[PDB]
């Protein structure tokens, strides 16, 4: 469904 | 299922 972008804020 | 971390490499 969705890949984690291995990042964030 | 998974939240996008609105980021990445």
């Amino acid at each position: 469904s969705c890949p984690p972008c291995k990042c964030g804020w």
Side-chain angles (χ1 to χ4, degrees), chain A:
Chain A
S1 182
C2 24
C5 40
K6 302 185 184 299
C7 185
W9 307 109

mmCIF file of all heavy atoms in Angstrom, chain A:
data_model
loop_
_atom_site.group_PDB
_atom_site.id
_atom_site.type_symbol
_atom_site.label_atom_id
_atom_site.label_comp_id
_atom_site.label_asym_id
_atom_site.label_seq_id
_atom_site.Cartn_x
_atom_site.Cartn_y
_atom_site.Cartn_z
ATOM 1 N N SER A 1 0.839 -1.218 0.000
ATOM 2 C CA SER A 1 0.000 0.000 0.000
ATOM 3 C C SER A 1 0.866 1.258 0.000
ATOM 4 O O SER A 1 0.632 2.182 -0.783
ATOM 5 C CB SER A 1 -0.927 0.002 1.221
ATOM 6 O OG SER A 1 -1.784 1.135 1.219
ATOM 7 N N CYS A 2 1.872 1.292 0.867
ATOM 8 C CA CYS A 2 2.702 2.478 1.014
ATOM 9 C C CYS A 2 4.105 2.133 1.510
ATOM 10 O O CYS A 2 4.271 1.386 2.473
ATOM 11 C CB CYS A 2 2.029 3.469 1.973
ATOM 12 S SG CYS A 2 0.848 2.708 3.144
ATOM 13 N N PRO A 3 5.139 2.646 0.832
ATOM 14 C CA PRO A 3 6.514 2.504 1.277
ATOM 15 C C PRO A 3 6.931 3.633 2.222
ATOM 16 O O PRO A 3 6.712 4.810 1.931
ATOM 17 C CB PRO A 3 7.300 2.579 -0.030
ATOM 18 C CG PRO A 3 6.485 3.455 -0.926
ATOM 19 C CD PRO A 3 5.053 3.381 -0.443
ATOM 20 N N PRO A 4 7.506 3.296 3.386
ATOM 21 C CA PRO A 4 8.055 4.299 4.296
ATOM 22 C C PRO A 4 9.258 4.991 3.671
ATOM 23 O O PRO A 4 10.171 4.331 3.174
ATOM 24 C CB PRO A 4 8.476 3.491 5.529
ATOM 25 C CG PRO A 4 8.642 2.093 5.036
ATOM 26 C CD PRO A 4 7.663 1.926 3.906
ATOM 27 N N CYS A 5 9.268 6.315 3.693
ATOM 28 C CA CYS A 5 10.333 7.069 3.048
ATOM 29 C C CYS A 5 11.573 7.176 3.928
ATOM 30 O O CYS A 5 12.470 7.977 3.669
ATOM 31 C CB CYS A 5 9.840 8.455 2.602
ATOM 32 S SG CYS A 5 8.710 9.333 3.755
ATOM 33 N N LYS A 6 11.599 6.334 4.957
ATOM 34 C CA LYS A 6 12.724 6.219 5.890
ATOM 35 C C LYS A 6 13.251 7.586 6.322
ATOM 36 O O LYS A 6 14.460 7.796 6.437
ATOM 37 C CB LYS A 6 13.847 5.389 5.268
ATOM 38 C CG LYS A 6 13.412 3.987 4.867
ATOM 39 C CD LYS A 6 14.585 3.164 4.364
ATOM 40 C CE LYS A 6 14.136 1.800 3.867
ATOM 41 N NZ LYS A 6 13.484 1.003 4.940
ATOM 42 N N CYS A 7 12.337 8.506 6.569
ATOM 43 C CA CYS A 7 12.690 9.868 6.919
ATOM 44 C C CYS A 7 11.522 10.506 7.660
ATOM 45 O O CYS A 7 10.811 9.827 8.399
ATOM 46 C CB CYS A 7 13.044 10.659 5.648
ATOM 47 S SG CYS A 7 13.660 12.357 5.950
ATOM 48 N N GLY A 8 11.314 11.791 7.457
ATOM 49 C CA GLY A 8 10.250 12.487 8.140
ATOM 50 C C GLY A 8 10.637 13.901 8.480
ATOM 51 O O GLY A 8 11.536 14.470 7.857
ATOM 52 N N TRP A 9 9.974 14.469 9.468
ATOM 53 C CA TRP A 9 10.271 15.820 9.897
ATOM 54 C C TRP A 9 11.211 15.781 11.091
ATOM 55 O O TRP A 9 12.425 16.004 10.897
ATOM 56 C CB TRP A 9 8.982 16.566 10.247
ATOM 57 C CG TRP A 9 7.962 16.531 9.148
ATOM 58 C CD1 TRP A 9 6.791 15.831 9.143
ATOM 59 C CD2 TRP A 9 8.030 17.209 7.888
ATOM 60 N NE1 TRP A 9 6.122 16.035 7.961
ATOM 61 C CE2 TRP A 9 6.863 16.877 7.174
ATOM 62 C CE3 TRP A 9 8.963 18.064 7.294
ATOM 63 C CZ2 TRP A 9 6.605 17.374 5.896
ATOM 64 C CZ3 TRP A 9 8.705 18.557 6.029
ATOM 65 C CH2 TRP A 9 7.535 18.210 5.342
#
